Design a protein around this ligand. Structure first.
Ligand code: NA
Length: 82
């Protein structure tokens, strides 16, 4: 680990102030999450995160349910992280 080929999603277009806990809380509504890494980037530029679910099926559900939803004013893009 900590990532998994089908268990990890990549989330794009997060606001720069997003915290790991905020990501955890939002994404864990789909299923339990094992880890969250947020990419280190300049403030006021879009951020990315890798979110790894405990179960592959829940990763797929997050892609379906949470892609192009609004998170802190941003439309987030959710897909396989591979
Ligand atoms: Na980075």
């Amino acid at each position: 680990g900590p990532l998994g080929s089908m268990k990890t999603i990549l989330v794009k277009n997060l606001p720069s102030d997003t915290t790991q806990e905020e990501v955890l809380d939002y994404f864990s509504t789909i299923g339990p999450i094992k880890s969250v890494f947020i990419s280190e980037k300049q403030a006021n530029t879009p951020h990315k995160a890798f979110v790894t679910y405990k179960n592959e099926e829940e990763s797929k559900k997050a892609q379906k349910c949470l892609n192009k939803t609004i998170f802190k004013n941003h439309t987030i893009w959710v897909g396989p992280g591979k």
